[PDB]
Amino acid sequence: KIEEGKLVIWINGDKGYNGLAEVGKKFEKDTGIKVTVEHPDKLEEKFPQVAATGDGPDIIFWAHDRFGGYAQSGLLAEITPDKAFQDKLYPFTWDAVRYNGKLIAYPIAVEALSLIYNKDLLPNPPKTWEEIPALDKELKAKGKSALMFNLQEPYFTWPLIAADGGYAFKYENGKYDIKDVGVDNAGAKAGLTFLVDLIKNKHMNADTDYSIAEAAFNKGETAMTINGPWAWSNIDTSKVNYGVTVLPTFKGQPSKPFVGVLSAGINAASPNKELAKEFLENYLLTDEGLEAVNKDKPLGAVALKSYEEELAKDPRIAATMENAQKGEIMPNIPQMSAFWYAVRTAVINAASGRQTVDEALKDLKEKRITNTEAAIATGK
Numbered sequence: 001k002i003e004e005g006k007l008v009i010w011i012n013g014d015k016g017y018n019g020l021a022e023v024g025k026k027f028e029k030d031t032g033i034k035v036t037v038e039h040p041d042k043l044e045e046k047f048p049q050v051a052a053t054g055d056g057p058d059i060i061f062w063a064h065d066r067f068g069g070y071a072q073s074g075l076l077a078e079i080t081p082d083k084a085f086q087d088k089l090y091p092f093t094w095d096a097v098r099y100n101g102k103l104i105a106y107p108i109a110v111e112a113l114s115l116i117y118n119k120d121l122l123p124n125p126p127k128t129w130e131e132i133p134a135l136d137k138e139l140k141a142k143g144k145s146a147l148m149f150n151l152q153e154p155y156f157t158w159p160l161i162a163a164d165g166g167y168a169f170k171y172e173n174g175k176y177d178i179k180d181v182g183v184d185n186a187g188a189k190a191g192l193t194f195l196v197d198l199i200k201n202k203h204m205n206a207d208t209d210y211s212i213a214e215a216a217f218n219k220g221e222t223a224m225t226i227n228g229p230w231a232w233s234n235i236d237t238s239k240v241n242y243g244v245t246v247l248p249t250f251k252g253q254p255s256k257p258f259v260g261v262l263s264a265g266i267n268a269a270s271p272n273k274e275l276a277k278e279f280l281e282n283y284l285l286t287d288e289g290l291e292a293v294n295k296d297k298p299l300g301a302v303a304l305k306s307y308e309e310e311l312a313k314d315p316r317i318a319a320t321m322e323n324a325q326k327g328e329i330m331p332n333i334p335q336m337s338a339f340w341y342a343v344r345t346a347v348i349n350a351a352s353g354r355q356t357v358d359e360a361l362k363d364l365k366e367k368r369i370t371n372t373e374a375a376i377a378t379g380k
């Protein structure tokens with residue numbers, strides 16, 4: 001059961017949960033309502049189990065891609081922003097939180113992976129994926145490593161799979177065709193094949209993860225990483241002189257990172273729907289509230305127009321938007337959960353040699369996405 005006269009907010013560990021707590025304490029001062037911010041693990045999996053029963057947090061933060069499945073499960077209170085509120089945010093960020101004609105969450109910020117590089121180790125970063133092997137060989141002679149990024153989560157490898165023609169679900173009227181999967185087409189095979197080639201030649205490791213890759217770049221042992229704006233705060237701390245820049249091309253085609261819209265939904269079983277609406281519209285989506293959060297750990301290109309005009313000055317945010325333009329907004333449909341689960345098995349297996357690239361993502365299309373779609377939609 002959720003307590004009336006209180007807000008509990010859930011956001012991911014990698015985001016600025018402490019800045020958001022400052023917006024919490026400001027809210028507390030004005031209204032008397034205590035705001036408790038939490039960053040539990042496997043947040044996106046924990047919210048559905050907990051909220052369906054009883055009852056979870058009042059407000060949930062995640063990128064938009066998971067919110068269709070949440071609305072479809074009945075978990076999100078349909079929001080009620082008026083026209084004046086809407087026009088303070090960029091039209092395409094509203095689109096990412098629209099589902100069956102209705103808005104279901106407030107959009108916060110636009111997240112896109114970029115190439116992050118060490119200027120001292122690598123003044124002039126490589127423009128292409130094809131240049132990386134040779135660079136790694138040149139850096140292995142001096143004890144260091146060319147590129148180290150998270151290979152456990154498909155969000156990070158996707159830019160390379162999509163680069164040459166791969167895609168999740170086709171767009172369409174539309175409308176996304178869940179029968180038309182672009183995950184065993186030639187562009188994906190080519191992107192994943194290239195990735196597994198880097199791993200066969202000892203240029204990357206299969207079992208590199210978010211922690212390991214961050215530690216590596218931040219302690220000056222890698223020339224390059226691939227991360228989002230949330231990670232800039234800790235590179236700042238490490239003192240590594242770094243730059244954020246366009247993702248490398250593959251066969252001359254831009255890397256196409258899936259673009260996420262950090263979003264806030266109101267739990268459907270919360271008795272504090274108004275307090276939540278007040279919190280999000282009047283405290284968070286202000287220059288001042290988005291400042292507090294952005295200063296803990298940056299959001300990227302925020303959805304609020306007035307504050308974005310101050311942030312577009314940052315070269316590192318111009319690079320984030322450069323990369324987002326080259327990419328595609330993520331679908332928000334419910335079958336994204338299924339899609340993500342399956343793709344994560346395929347890539348891990350392909351990357352570890354358990355299967356070949358052609359086997360891994362032939363199984364994916366032919367059975368795993370549909371099997372997982374059916375498993376998610378059946379109860380377990």
Ligand SMILES: OC[C@H]1O[C@H](O[C@H]2[C@H](O)[C@@H](O)[C@@H](O)O[C@@H]2CO)[C@H](O)[C@@H](O)[C@@H]1O
Pocket residue numbers: 012014044063065066111153154155156260340
């Ligand atoms: O890797 C699958 C995962 O990708 C995305 O998650 C991102 C998220 O958008 C970022 O904001 C940050 O939290 O890193 C995550 C990668 O672990 C999808 O948004 C998410 O649904 C999916 O599980």
